[PDB]
Design an enzyme around this catalytic site. Structure first.
Site, PDB file in Angstrom:
ATOM      1  N   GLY A  16      -1.249  -2.225   5.668  1.00 54.58           N
ATOM      2  CA  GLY A  16      -0.842  -3.396   6.443  1.00 54.58           C
ATOM      3  C   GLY A  16      -1.738  -4.589   6.181  1.00 54.58           C
ATOM      4  O   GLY A  16      -2.130  -4.837   5.043  1.00 54.58           O
ATOM      5  N   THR A  21       0.792  -1.276   0.000  1.00 51.45           N
ATOM      6  CA  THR A  21       0.000   0.000   0.000  1.00 51.45           C
ATOM      7  C   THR A  21       0.812   1.307   0.000  1.00 51.45           C
ATOM      8  O   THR A  21       1.948   1.349   0.471  1.00 51.45           O
ATOM      9  CB  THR A  21      -0.874   0.017   1.253  1.00 51.45           C
ATOM     10  OG1 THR A  21      -1.706  -1.133   1.239  1.00 51.45           O
ATOM     11  CG2 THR A  21      -1.808   1.222   1.316  1.00 51.45           C
ATOM     12  N   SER A  28       2.304  -0.985  -4.490  1.00 54.97           N
ATOM     13  CA  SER A  28       1.201  -0.069  -4.756  1.00 54.97           C
ATOM     14  C   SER A  28       0.937   0.032  -6.250  1.00 54.97           C
ATOM     15  O   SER A  28       1.835  -0.204  -7.066  1.00 54.97           O
ATOM     16  CB  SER A  28       1.532   1.306  -4.193  1.00 54.97           C
ATOM     17  OG  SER A  28       2.106   1.187  -2.904  1.00 54.97           O
ATOM     18  N   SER A  61       3.984   0.483   2.195  1.00 51.12           N
ATOM     19  CA  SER A  61       5.202   0.069   1.489  1.00 51.12           C
ATOM     20  C   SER A  61       5.760   1.173   0.591  1.00 51.12           C
ATOM     21  O   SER A  61       6.974   1.268   0.401  1.00 51.12           O
ATOM     22  CB  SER A  61       4.940  -1.188   0.649  1.00 51.12           C
ATOM     23  OG  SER A  61       3.857  -0.998  -0.248  1.00 51.12           O
ATOM     24  N   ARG A 101      -4.407  -0.970  -4.819  1.00 52.86           N
ATOM     25  CA  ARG A 101      -3.862  -2.312  -5.040  1.00 52.86           C
ATOM     26  C   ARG A 101      -3.937  -3.139  -3.762  1.00 52.86           C
ATOM     27  O   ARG A 101      -3.654  -2.638  -2.678  1.00 52.86           O
ATOM     28  CB  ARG A 101      -2.407  -2.243  -5.517  1.00 52.86           C
ATOM     29  CG  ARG A 101      -1.745  -3.608  -5.688  1.00 52.86           C
ATOM     30  CD  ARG A 101      -0.379  -3.509  -6.350  1.00 52.86           C
ATOM     31  NE  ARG A 101      -0.466  -3.136  -7.761  1.00 52.86           N
ATOM     32  CZ  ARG A 101       0.572  -3.052  -8.593  1.00 52.86           C
ATOM     33  NH1 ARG A 101       1.806  -3.315  -8.174  1.00 52.86           N
ATOM     34  NH2 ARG A 101       0.374  -2.704  -9.859  1.00 52.86           N
ATOM     35  N   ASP A 133      -3.809   4.475  -2.682  1.00 48.71           N
ATOM     36  CA  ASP A 133      -3.867   3.690  -3.911  1.00 48.71           C
ATOM     37  C   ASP A 133      -4.955   2.624  -3.744  1.00 48.71           C
ATOM     38  O   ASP A 133      -5.663   2.613  -2.732  1.00 48.71           O
ATOM     39  CB  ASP A 133      -2.506   3.067  -4.245  1.00 48.71           C
ATOM     40  CG  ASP A 133      -2.178   1.872  -3.375  1.00 48.71           C
ATOM     41  OD1 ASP A 133      -2.251   1.999  -2.137  1.00 48.71           O
ATOM     42  OD2 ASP A 133      -1.847   0.804  -3.930  1.00 48.71           O
ATOM     43  N   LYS A 166      -9.324   1.633   0.285  1.00 51.93           N
ATOM     44  CA  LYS A 166      -8.515   1.715   1.505  1.00 51.93           C
ATOM     45  C   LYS A 166      -8.909   2.894   2.396  1.00 51.93           C
ATOM     46  O   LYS A 166      -8.409   3.023   3.515  1.00 51.93           O
ATOM     47  CB  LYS A 166      -7.035   1.800   1.137  1.00 51.93           C
ATOM     48  CG  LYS A 166      -6.609   0.718   0.162  1.00 51.93           C
ATOM     49  CD  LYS A 166      -5.109   0.689  -0.025  1.00 51.93           C
ATOM     50  CE  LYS A 166      -4.715  -0.254  -1.147  1.00 51.93           C
ATOM     51  NZ  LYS A 166      -3.241  -0.435  -1.210  1.00 51.93           N
ATOM     52  N   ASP A 189       6.711   2.048  -6.341  1.00 46.60           N
ATOM     53  CA  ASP A 189       6.576   0.932  -5.403  1.00 46.60           C
ATOM     54  C   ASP A 189       5.765  -0.193  -6.041  1.00 46.60           C
ATOM     55  O   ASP A 189       4.663   0.039  -6.546  1.00 46.60           O
ATOM     56  CB  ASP A 189       5.895   1.395  -4.111  1.00 46.60           C
ATOM     57  CG  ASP A 189       5.788   0.293  -3.073  1.00 46.60           C
ATOM     58  OD1 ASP A 189       6.741  -0.504  -2.940  1.00 46.60           O
ATOM     59  OD2 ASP A 189       4.746   0.225  -2.387  1.00 46.60           O
TER      60      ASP A 189
HETATM   61  C1  LIG Z   1      -0.028  -2.529   0.192  1.00 51.70           C
HETATM   62  C2  LIG Z   1      -0.820  -2.866  -1.098  1.00 51.70           C
HETATM   63  C3  LIG Z   1       1.012  -3.630   0.455  1.00 51.70           C
HETATM   64  O1  LIG Z   1       0.443  -4.864   0.815  1.00 51.70           O
HETATM   65  C4  LIG Z   1      -1.026  -2.378   1.419  1.00 51.70           C
HETATM   66  O2  LIG Z   1      -0.285  -2.383   2.638  1.00 51.70           O
HETATM   67  C5  LIG Z   1      -2.165  -3.414   1.535  1.00 51.70           C
HETATM   68  C6  LIG Z   1      -3.142  -2.930   2.592  1.00 51.70           C
HETATM   69  C7  LIG Z   1      -4.575  -2.783   2.037  1.00 51.70           C
HETATM   70  C8  LIG Z   1      -5.083  -4.055   1.341  1.00 51.70           C
HETATM   71  C9  LIG Z   1      -5.502  -2.465   3.221  1.00 51.70           C
HETATM   72  N1  LIG Z   1      -1.752  -4.685   2.111  1.00 51.70           N
HETATM   73  C10 LIG Z   1      -2.199  -5.848   1.624  1.00 51.70           C
HETATM   74  O3  LIG Z   1      -2.876  -5.969   0.603  1.00 51.70           O
HETATM   75  C11 LIG Z   1      -1.814  -7.064   2.446  1.00 51.70           C
HETATM   76  C12 LIG Z   1      -0.338  -7.296   2.384  1.00 51.70           C
HETATM   77  C13 LIG Z   1      -0.090  -8.185   3.425  1.00 51.70           C
HETATM   78  C14 LIG Z   1      -0.010  -9.551   3.170  1.00 51.70           C
HETATM   79  C15 LIG Z   1       0.235 -10.443   4.208  1.00 51.70           C
HETATM   80  C16 LIG Z   1       0.395  -9.970   5.507  1.00 51.70           C
HETATM   81  C17 LIG Z   1       0.311  -8.605   5.766  1.00 51.70           C
HETATM   82  C18 LIG Z   1       0.069  -7.712   4.727  1.00 51.70           C
HETATM   83  N2  LIG Z   1      -2.569  -8.187   1.888  1.00 51.70           N
HETATM   84  C19 LIG Z   1      -3.572  -8.761   2.564  1.00 51.70           C
HETATM   85  O4  LIG Z   1      -3.910  -8.468   3.711  1.00 51.70           O
HETATM   86  C20 LIG Z   1      -4.285  -9.873   1.816  1.00 51.70           C
HETATM   87  C21 LIG Z   1      -5.661  -9.384   1.465  1.00 51.70           C
HETATM   88  C22 LIG Z   1      -6.340 -10.489   0.641  1.00 51.70           C
HETATM   89  C23 LIG Z   1      -5.616 -10.719  -0.699  1.00 51.70           C
HETATM   90  C24 LIG Z   1      -7.799 -10.086   0.374  1.00 51.70           C
HETATM   91  N3  LIG Z   1      -4.331 -11.022   2.714  1.00 51.70           N
HETATM   92  C25 LIG Z   1      -3.331 -11.901   2.692  1.00 51.70           C
HETATM   93  O5  LIG Z   1      -2.359 -11.818   1.941  1.00 51.70           O
HETATM   94  C26 LIG Z   1      -3.416 -13.025   3.701  1.00 51.70           C
HETATM   95  C27 LIG Z   1      -2.703 -12.564   4.941  1.00 51.70           C
HETATM   96  C28 LIG Z   1      -3.523 -13.061   6.114  1.00 51.70           C
HETATM   97  C29 LIG Z   1      -2.772 -12.900   7.307  1.00 51.70           C
HETATM   98  C30 LIG Z   1      -2.814 -13.896   8.286  1.00 51.70           C
HETATM   99  C31 LIG Z   1      -2.096 -13.761   9.471  1.00 51.70           C
HETATM  100  C32 LIG Z   1      -1.325 -12.625   9.700  1.00 51.70           C
HETATM  101  C33 LIG Z   1      -1.278 -11.622   8.740  1.00 51.70           C
HETATM  102  C34 LIG Z   1      -1.999 -11.757   7.558  1.00 51.70           C
HETATM  103  N4  LIG Z   1      -2.673 -14.134   3.118  1.00 51.70           N
HETATM  104  C35 LIG Z   1      -3.274 -15.123   2.459  1.00 51.70           C
HETATM  105  O6  LIG Z   1      -4.494 -15.214   2.315  1.00 51.70           O
HETATM  106  C36 LIG Z   1      -2.292 -16.151   1.882  1.00 51.70           C
HETATM  107  N5  LIG Z   1      -2.705 -17.557   2.085  1.00 51.70           N
HETATM  108  C37 LIG Z   1      -3.823 -17.950   1.183  1.00 51.70           C
HETATM  109  C38 LIG Z   1      -4.047 -19.409   1.356  1.00 51.70           C
HETATM  110  O7  LIG Z   1      -4.435 -19.528   2.721  1.00 51.70           O
HETATM  111  C39 LIG Z   1      -3.308 -19.279   3.610  1.00 51.70           C
HETATM  112  C40 LIG Z   1      -2.991 -17.866   3.513  1.00 51.70           C
HETATM  113 MG   LIG Z   2       2.680  -4.703 -12.877  1.00 53.97          MG
END
Ligand SMILES: *[C@@](C)(CO)[C@](*)(O)[C@H](CC(C)C)NC(=O)[C@H](Cc1ccccc1)NC(=O)[C@H](CC(C)C)NC(=O)[C@H](CCc1ccccc1)NC(=O)CN1CCOCC1
Ligand SMILES: [Mg+2]
Ligand SMILES: *[C@@](C)(CO)[C@](*)(O)[C@H](CC(C)C)NC(=O)[C@H](Cc1ccccc1)NC(=O)[C@H](CC(C)C)NC(=O)[C@H](CCc1ccccc1)NC(=O)CN1CCOCC1
Ligand SMILES: *[C@@](C)(CO)[C@](*)(O)[C@H](CC(C)C)NC(=O)[C@H](Cc1ccccc1)NC(=O)[C@H](CC(C)C)NC(=O)[C@H](CCc1ccccc1)NC(=O)CN1CCOCC1
Ligand SMILES: [Cl-]
Ligand SMILES: [Mg+2]
Ligand SMILES: [Mg+2]
Lengths: 222, 212, 125, 233, 204, 196, 195, 222, 195
Positions: free
Chosen positions: A47, A1, A169, A129, A19, A17, A33, A166
């Site tokens: 996060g 993000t 994002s 990020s 993404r 953003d 967001k 980034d």
């Molecule tokens: C930027 C885009 C960088 O990521 C932002 O910070 C965004 C925030 C927005 C969405 C509010 N962050 C994310 O998109 C975030 C990045 C991330 C990933 C993992 C940990 C922390 C941050 N992504 C997510 O939260 C996604 C959202 C989904 C795609 C709708 N969720 C996951 O990636 C989950 C993480 C769940 C989790 C569990 C325990 C502790 C922390 C996080 N991961 C999965 O679903 C992966 N996997 C799928 C199969 O089942 C097992 C888990």
């Molecule tokens: Mg690309």
């Protein structure tokens, strides 16, 4: 993000953003967001996606009940206090990194909250990020006494820096403007500089391409 | 992988699948797991793809150098032992190879040698090697007789790979058949599991676990 | 290490050291080999200027390289031991890798190869 | 296997219409201790190349000696050492890139990130990066460490692609570099105010600027910031 | 010992012109061993369809749980739950187990009976909602499904055309994943009729 | 962080830099580490931002409730509440706090509370990562019963050096003056203090 | 505990369970019955961690028998399997889970159909024509894929089962000391004494 | 502890026609969440109508390409300027890769060109040298996204003839250079949308009997 | 590789060696001969790490056969065992040691006495009336302590050996697929085909 917040003359503006990632995979190309805690207090979240949504809704719910109890419009510091104490209690395990902003009877405000429960005050802030890409722009172009239109431009420019530079994002730019004495305007997809180009070919299959073994009508009625 | 080769009345049958995986990622469905060392020698390949492919290609060069030097085709025993002595030098280094050296010579007759990367070398009539070896064994053992015909033996080998291709997640693609006689090896075609499964299910009446 | 090229060509195209090694063979006691329809026989001369010999323990002229191959010789006795030893080791090494004893041609080819190597290696005769 | 001890932070650089600009601060950090303040991290090779180095300073000094020795070796039996057979930026880079990768391949790396900026004999701009892993890449803007995260975004607003290079003057380009250095002073905890800047132009040649300082900083707004949320005093 | 990839499986959902499609494979295995080729991953509560990939015990547990909750919903509300509302219920339920989560990748699909609007949504294991116009993917071959859907998909497909697109997206993705396949089911959902088709695919 | 509190003739002065870091990134360059727990009892915060804030918030709550029942608390009382939190939760806290306050009876007082949760009453106190570099300087230059201008110069020169050598310290030098006159905030920018 | 098999045929369910109980380098017993009768027409075999297996099996048995007395009625095999699955599904997120895998063979008297359920320690339930737990499956599934037909008789099912045991005895590393076979049909549960 | 490997992202794609072959690859180079270069080519003409790309860890990729290019040069010196056939090149590369079996080149290698019958050829290698000739191969970060699409569109997998009851398969046929480039471009735009490490630009190298042609296309820069 | 036994009686040495070659969950072979003839009156059985066993056995065999040809003379069992021990004693402090345990049964023609030597992979040699390697010893030693007599015949030794194999087949966890028995006496080495 990438998320930012920028103060101006008669209020505050926040941006983000759109993404949402799942490892290196883009799960949602246009997620929202920017969250509404109360009508004139809004929150940008980075996060752990579930955590930023859950914590913002919970505090938003309690803020509404508090507003009804006290017969007063809610204050940003109340949301700030309730968020930080909740996050601190969970010792960082709730991975919500928030930029909290809004207007209330006290005035206009801009804060940031980190997962471990620390808060910061500022005229311009950036989290996520792509915060370094955004903060570079904010540090280069920010000044005191910004107008509404100048703050929106600076905020969206800071988000764009994140979008392009980034990998965490991308896609679009959401904006929310909270001005004093006026309704907050939520500008969903304020900029859309990442439109998918026309595909070279249509992949519409001739009907009957897929081999089928059985058919049956499903009963959804009672 | 799943690979087998068994000895019988009419020579040797050799059957292998064609899948290659990198974890759960199916990387290829068209890999050649039988190496044609010479008109009378075959080698099967299971384990590390590069290790098998590189060293069995190398084995073929060593077998060629033998018949140049000795004016005579190398024995199946000597060929298998070149490979086993090679991998033994690399023991502990992390080579991953499950191979079977199959062939015919005058002095030996039809012969099969199991050779693996921790140095084991075994002569035998029946072997199944790979992640789906147990699935192949189940079908092969329960239907094996020495007095099988060339036609029935070819089918059993094919059917045994098919069985493993079905159950084992890391086996599949297609079945490659070989028949080794006193006159040399004979290729008996590539058989895609996509068509072969349904063809076998219908004609044989088996695979009743699957939705027809 | 001693490097000197001892075996070298002469103007007339001869390697004298190899040819003088043949003279040593010509000096040695006679040895004969005759092969029949189903057998081979190796005959060997023993000079009779040596009485008071102990024939039990005196090195025999014919040597077993393996259980199926034998080697007799003419020339320097001390030199023959080195070839026999090398041949016996190669005989066991062949059984170990090829899982089959040496052919008589192969064993000969090996021994002959050792002899050749000493005609164009530095420091050796 | 190493661990870096005395370290240098960001090196930033970009192309402009007639040449290249490169800059790096004069700090030699010892962990959190800002130990050495007179460290030059831009090293010219001839009158047409400048090598900017970040990371371990002991290894930087080794690389200095190699480049110094490279000039000497090139001069040997070379009547055209100051003319056609002079050292090119591309030669100097490829040499370093070879060394960096050979050292990583022997599991004993030179713990550095290097940017070779210069102008070729045919007038073409040269700007390429190499690091401890032997990884190489080129771009209109290049930066190491925090520079990659904060400088590049700012420098890419000036030169976003190849076609923007002829449109960018040395005045505009230097201004962006000097701005980036200020931003890094605000935000990089292992940076210093003092820095060096080098311009290699195809016309005016090598200009090496020492003892520059970050200036025109915004700090006044700090006085209005009280507490961390509620506090009003 | 990675819960989400022990049993294996996939789910994909798409939208079309006044219709939605949701599809899944039939495999249930224990790592390399294929165990069952009848294990369906799509369930429905009234007109709302839920697909669930991941750890099979949780797939079963959650189905039973959402049947439980939707049945009580219907008794008290005196109407069937809608996709938008159900999506929120799924999110709530999953996040309730934030620090001891169900190892699943659920996918909601259905048409709102009031507005007639096609609706799909996806979630991570702790309940984060992923809403989409076009498509949602889930399972051990999610990368493959993302690649297939992103190239094959186009908006406003007719139910008969949409069937071909989603089926080809699932089939070819499943064939590049060792833990997915062994049969497949596709649900085509119109406003007041639902067709269920079993696909012929390679059984390895 | 670089923080310090110094007693003098008219009362006490608190001093601090304005840098907050995540690794080597400066998350906030204009931080206010000098925080009010009561009218004329303040504290300098070092260590975890989250922990020190959570603590300071609780202390402010306790002293507000103390004031409602028993009137103005002593600076010693404030330090005791800080200690009680820091000591009893030593396993879960990273907080180095300097408590400073002005009574009319006791004048200026300074209590320092390190990681362990121990309390130490001192004429002046230094703390935070950047304090290590100025132990030598501060010891040689501190005098009791200094004037306001002398104490401001002592803190300014001290934190200037701390900032110069410590990468984890920087930005502006904030100060808070506690005397009978009232509460005065002071700020000093890089352009001034760097060239001291 | 190691080998447990199950085969559902036309009119019955056949469960085969190994007799060996090894612990260490010693086969402590070679006549162990790894099964409990849950009700007159429902049988559950089990395999897994020592102690856990019997403790779990008897706990389920007690619960099903309690239900039978309370309602004066026999639960369906489907109902019993669902109860068992839920107990294991609870168990897996406990402080100390039951590490027990089970097969539930039963004859539904209302449907007049045999039913075989395979449930692992995680609470993963599947209805199958033939089932196995542990390493057994790696041989028997492919074998049954080939030889099994849905319309087979109980006698044909026993021959099909003999074919499995033979293959296991040939290719399995450990000596499991043969199997105890039990049949579940319309007339209840009975044991084959000569196998 | 020092880690000698790194991930420079990116993705590559090889398709073979009847009398031609293409080898495509995006021009983005990355480390973690930062972009290093928007245009850093990794598909190279190596001479003798052989194009090569070694995607993954760029330092190892460059080293390999460099060494193979050098192998081609010495093949000419040692064998009277003989043209290195694509099959011979492949085998040579296997030995280059396997030569470092115990300290591998962390790359997915793909080469393309024409075989000795003039027909299009694509070979693909794992990091330690196992190789295979194919009509089709994607490699790198977004290989898992692109490859199943290629199975469907190049090799017509899971496609049956309409109305034949899933009994007759869609017949295999060679694709035109025009149709192949459409599939490449659509594959990379799709990969760019859903993978963060893929974007900026697309560079395709086309190989016919006439020589090696290049085509470049813009990709989304977020 | 697992079970290797040895019994020295009045006029012979009897070696019994298991036939199973197992790897993972599959018995790859059930007719493996885990022995090599070092000389006409000396036999060595072996068990241990895969590959190492045969490689070591054949290496010793080649060396002893080389000695026999060179000297036209058979080494005594004592001499061979000492040679083998030294090779293992070197091995244990190598970069990669041979993980092979061996029994050397031989008949000394000069003494007219049978001899059994037990040597482990460390190079630990002991002459014994009866010997075993691996887990076998934990059952057979106590059994032989009871039933063994020094003046037994070869036939009595085979019955005593049958008693060991029966006990192992009863109490050992793994199926070792029976044993190949070989006898070493004044007339050389011969194999018992029906055991
Ligand atoms: C930027 C885009 C960088 O990521 C932002 O910070 C965004 C925030 C927005 C969405 C509010 N962050 C994310 O998109 C975030 C990045 C991330 C990933 C993992 C940990 C922390 C941050 N992504 C997510 O939260 C996604 C959202 C989904 C795609 C709708 N969720 C996951 O990636 C989950 C993480 C769940 C989790 C569990 C325990 C502790 C922390 C996080 N991961 C999965 O679903 C992966 N996997 C799928 C199969 O089942 C097992 C888990
Ligand atoms: Mg690309
Ligand atoms: C059955 C089909 C599965 O076990 C067979 O056993 C086959 C044998 C056939 C191919 C001869 N085995 C494999 O397919 C084998 C399984 C395997 C993998 C790795 C180690 C041991 C066994 N697969 C491979 O060898 C693959 C084949 C490629 C993908 C075509 N190769 C890899 O996984 C390579 C090389 C692995 C390796 C071995 C030794 C040192 C270094 C590396 N690894 C990668 O490509 C890594 N990774 C793949 C995913 O994409 C990112 C890079
Ligand atoms: C000087 C700077 C050092 O003594 C001062 O003491 C200041 C005190 C002021 C701010 C009150 N201290 C800090 O700035 C403090 C330093 C620190 C860091 C970690 C543990 C203890 C002290 N910084 C912080 O507390 C920041 C504040 C954020 C940026 C608003 N927080 C972090 O650095 C978090 C804290 C996590 C944490 C760890 C252990 C105990 C409590 C909290 N750290 C991270 O997020 C780690 N980060 C993860 C992503 O990769 C980069 C590292
Ligand atoms: Cl703070
Ligand atoms: Mg399979
Ligand atoms: Mg500083």
């Amino acid at each position: 993000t990438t998320i930012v917040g920028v103060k101006f003359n008669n209020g505050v503006v926040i941006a983000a953003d759109t993404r949402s990632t799942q490892g290196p995979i883009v799960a949602d190309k246009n997620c929202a967001k920017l969250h509404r805690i109360s009508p004139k207090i809004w929150c940008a979240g980075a996060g752990t996606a579930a955590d930023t949504e859950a914590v913002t809704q919970l505090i938003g719910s309690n803020i509404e009940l508090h507003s009804l109890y006290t017969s007063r419009e809610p204050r940003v510091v109340s949301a700030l206090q309730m968020l930080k104490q909740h996050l601190f209690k969970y010792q960082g395990h709730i991975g919500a990194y928030l930029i909290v902003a809004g207007v209330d009877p006290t005035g206009s405000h801009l804060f940031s909250i980190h997962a471990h429960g620390s808060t910061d005050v500022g005229y311009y802030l950036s989290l996520g990020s792509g915060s370094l890409a955004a903060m570079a722009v904010l540090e280069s172009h920010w000044k005191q006494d910004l107008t509404k239109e100048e703050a929106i431009k600076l905020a969206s420019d800071a988000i764009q820096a994140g979008i392009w530079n980034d990998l965490g994002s991308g896609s679009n730019v959401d904006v929310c403007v909270m001005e004093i004495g006026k309704d907050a305007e939520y500008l969903r997809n304020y900029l859309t500089p990442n439109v998918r180009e026309e595909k070279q070919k249509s992949y519409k299959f001739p009907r009957g391409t897929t081999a089928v073994l059985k058919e049956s009508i499903v009963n959804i009625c009672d | 992988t799943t690979t087998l080769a068994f000895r019988f009345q009419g020579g040797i049958i050799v059957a292998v699948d064609s899948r290659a995986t990198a974890g759960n990622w199916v990387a290829s469905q068209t890999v050649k797991k039988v190496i044609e060392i010479n008109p009378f020698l075959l080698g099967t390949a299971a384990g590390g793809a590069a290790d098998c492919q590189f060293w069995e290609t190398w084995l073929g060069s060593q077998c060629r150098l033998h018949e140049l030097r000795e004016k005579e085709r190398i024995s199946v025993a000597a060929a298998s032992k070149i490979l086993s002595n090679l991998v033994y030098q690399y023991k502990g280094a992390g080579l991953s190879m499950g191979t079977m050296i199959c062939g015919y010579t005058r002095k030996e007759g039809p012969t099969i040698y199991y050779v693996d990367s921790d140095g084991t070398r075994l002569k035998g009539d029946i072997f199944c090697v790979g992640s789906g070896q147990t699935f192949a064994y189940g079908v092969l053992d329960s239907n094996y007789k020495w007095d099988l015909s060339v036609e029935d033996a070819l089918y059993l080998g094919k059917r045994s790979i098919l069985a493993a291709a079905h159950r084992d997640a890391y086996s599949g693609g297609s079945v490659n058949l070989y028949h080794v006689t006193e006159d040399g090896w004979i290729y008996h075609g590539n058989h895609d599991v996509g068509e072969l499964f349904w063809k076998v299910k219908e004609e044989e009446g088996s695979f009743n676990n699957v939705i027809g | 290490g001693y490097d000197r090229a001892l075996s070298i060509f002469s103007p007339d195209g001869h390697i004298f050291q190899v040819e003088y090694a043949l003279e040593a063979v010509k000096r040695g006691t006679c040895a004969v080999g005759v092969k029949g329809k189903n057998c081979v026989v190796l005959g060997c001369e023993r000079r009779s200027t040596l009485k008071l010999q102990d024939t039990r323990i005196t090195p025999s002229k014919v040597s077993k390289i393996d259980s199926h191959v034998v080697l007799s010789f003419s020339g320097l006795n001390a030199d023959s031991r080195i070839l026999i030893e090398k041949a016996r080791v190669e005989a066991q090494s062949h059984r170990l890798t090829l899982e089959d004893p040496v052919t008589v041609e192969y064993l000969t080819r090996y021994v002959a190869g050792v002899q050749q190597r000493y005609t164009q290696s530095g420091g050796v005769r | 296997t190493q661990q870096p001890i005395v370290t240098g932070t960001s090196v930033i650089s970009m192309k402009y219409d007639n040449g290249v600009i490169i800059a790096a601060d004069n700090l030699g950090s010892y962990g959190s201790l800002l130990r050495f303040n007179g460290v030059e991290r831009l090293i010219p090779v001839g009158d047409n190349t400048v090598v900017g180095i970040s990371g371990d300073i002991s290894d930087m000094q080794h690389i200095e000696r190699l480049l110094k020795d490279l000039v000497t070796e090139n001069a040997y039996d070379n009547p055209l050492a100051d003319a056609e057979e002079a050292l090119e930026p591309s030669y100097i880079f490829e040499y370093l890139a070879t060394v960096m990768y050979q050292r990583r391949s022997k599991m004993n790396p030179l713990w550095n990130a290097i940017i070779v900026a210069g102008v070729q004999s045919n007038g073409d701009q040269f700007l390429r990066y190499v690091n401890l892993l032997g990884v190489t890449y080129s771009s209109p803007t290049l930066a190491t460490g925090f520079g990659a995260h904060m400088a590049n975004p700012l420098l890419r607003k000036v030169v976003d692609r190849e076609s923007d290079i002829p449109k960018t003057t040395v005045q505009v380009a230097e201004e962006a570099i000097v701005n980036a250095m200020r931003v890094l002073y605000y935000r990089d905890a292992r940076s210093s105010r003092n820095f060096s800047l080098a311009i290699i132009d195809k016309n005016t040649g090598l200009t090496f600027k020492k003892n520059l300082q970050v200036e025109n900083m915004k700090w006044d707004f700090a006085k209005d910031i009280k507490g961390y949320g509620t506090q009003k005093i | 010992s990675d819960p989400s990839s022990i049993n294996g499986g996939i789910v994909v959902a798409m939208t079309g012109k006044d219709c939605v499609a949701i599809a899944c494979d039939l495999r249930l295995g224990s790592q390399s061993l294929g165990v069952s080729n009848k294990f369906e991953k799509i369930f429905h509560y009234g007109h709302v369809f839920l697909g669930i990939t991941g750890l099979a015990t949780d797939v079963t547990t959650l189905n039973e749980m959402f049947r439980y909750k939707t049945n009580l919903y219907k008794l008290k509300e005196e109407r069937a739950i809608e996709p938008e509302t159900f999506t929120q219920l799924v999110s709530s339920s999953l996040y309730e187990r934030r620090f001891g989560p169900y190892f699943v990748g659920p996918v909601v699909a259905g048409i709102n009976s009031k507005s007639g609007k096609p609706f799909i949504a996806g979630f991570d294991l702790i309940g984060c909602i992923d809403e989409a116009k076009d498509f949602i993917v889930s399972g051990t071959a999610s990368d493959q499904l993302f690649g297939m859907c992103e190239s094959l998909y186009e908006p406003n497909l007719e139910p008969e055309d949409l069937f071909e697109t989603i089926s080809q997206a699932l089939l070819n993705a499943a064939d590049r994943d060792a833990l997915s396949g062994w049969g497949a089911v596709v649900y085509i959902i119109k406003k007041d009729e639902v067709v269920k088709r079993y696909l012929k695919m390679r059984q390895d | 962080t670089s923080i310090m509190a110094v007693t003098f003739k008219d009362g006490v002065i608190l001093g601090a830099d304005s840098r907050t870091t995540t690794g080597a990134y400066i998350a906030n360059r204009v931080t206010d580490k000098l925080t009010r727990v009561h009218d004329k009892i303040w504290c300098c915060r070092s260590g975890s931002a989250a922990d020190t804030q959570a603590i300071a918030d609780i202390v402010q709550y306790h002293l507000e409730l103390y004031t409602s029942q028993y009137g103005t608390p002593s600076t010693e009382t404030a330090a005791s509440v800080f200690k009680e939190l820091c000591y009893e939760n030593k396993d879960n806290l990273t907080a180095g706090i300097i408590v400073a306050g002005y009574d009319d009876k006791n004048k200026g007082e300074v209590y320092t509370i390190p990681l362990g949760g121990s309390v130490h009453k001192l004429p002046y106190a230094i703390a935070g990562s950047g304090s290590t570099f100025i132990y030598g300087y501060c010891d040689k230059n501190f005098r009791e019963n200094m004037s306001k201008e002398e104490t401001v110069d002592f803190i300014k020169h001290s934190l200037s050096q701390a900032i110069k050598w410590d990468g984890s310290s920087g930005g502006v030098i904030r100060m808070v003056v506690l005397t009978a006159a009232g509460v005065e905030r002071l700020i000093f920018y890089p352009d001034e203090y760097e060239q001291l | 505990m190691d080998i447990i098999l199950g085969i559902r045929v036309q009119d019955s369910v056949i469960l085969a369970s190994s007799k060996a109980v090894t612990r260490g380098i010693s086969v402590l017993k070679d006549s162990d019955d790894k099964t409990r009768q849950l009700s007159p027409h429902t049988l559950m075999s089990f395999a897994g961690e020592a102690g856990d297996t019997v403790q779990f099996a008897e706990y389920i048995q007690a619960n099903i028998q309690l239900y039978s007395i309370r309602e004066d009625y026999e639960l369906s095999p489907q109902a019993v399997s669902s109860f068992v699955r839920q107990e294991l599904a609870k168990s897996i997120r406990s402080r100390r889970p039951y590490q027990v895998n089970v097969l539930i063979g039963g004859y539904d008297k209302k449907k007049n159909k045999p039913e075989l359920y395979q449930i692992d320690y995680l609470g993963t339930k599947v209805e199958l024509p033939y089932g196995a737990h542990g390493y057994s499956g790696f041989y028997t599934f492919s074998l049954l894929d080939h030889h099994y037909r849905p319309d087979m008789t109980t006698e044909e099912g026993l021959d099909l089962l003999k074919l499995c045991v033979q293959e296991l005895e040939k290719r399995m590393p450990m000596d499991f000391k043969g199997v105890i076979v039990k049949i579940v049909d319309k007339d209840g549960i009975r044991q084959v004494d000569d196998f | 502890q020092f880690n000698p490997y790194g991930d420079n992202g990116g993705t590559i794609l090889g398709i073979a026609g009847e009398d031609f072959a293409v080898l495509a690859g995006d021009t983005r180079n990355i480390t973690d969440y930062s972009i290093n270069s928007r245009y850093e080519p990794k598909v190279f003409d190596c001479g003798d109508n052989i194009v090569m790309s070694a995607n993954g860890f760029a330092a190892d990729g460059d080293a390999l390409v460099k060494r193979f290019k050098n192998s081609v040069k010495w093949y000419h010196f040692d064998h009277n300027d003989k043209k290195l056939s694509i099959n011979s090149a492949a085998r040579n590369i296997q030995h280059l890769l396997y030569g470092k079996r115990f300290f591998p080149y962390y790359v997915h290698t793909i080469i393309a060109g024409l075989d000795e019958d003039g027909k299009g050829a694509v070979y693909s290698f794992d990091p330690v040298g196992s190789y295979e000739r194919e009509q089709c191969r994607a490699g790198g970060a977004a290989a898992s996204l692109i490859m199943p699409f290629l199975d469907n569109q190049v090799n017509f997998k899971n496609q049956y003839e309409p109305g034949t009851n899933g009994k007759v398969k869609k017949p295999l046929k060679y694709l035109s250079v025009e149709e192949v480039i459409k599939l490449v471009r659509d594959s990379f735009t799709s990969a760019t949308e859903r993978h963060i490490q893929v974007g900026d630009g697309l560079e395709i190298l086309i190989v016919t009997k006439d020589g090696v042609r290049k085509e470049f296309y813009e990709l989304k820069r977020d």
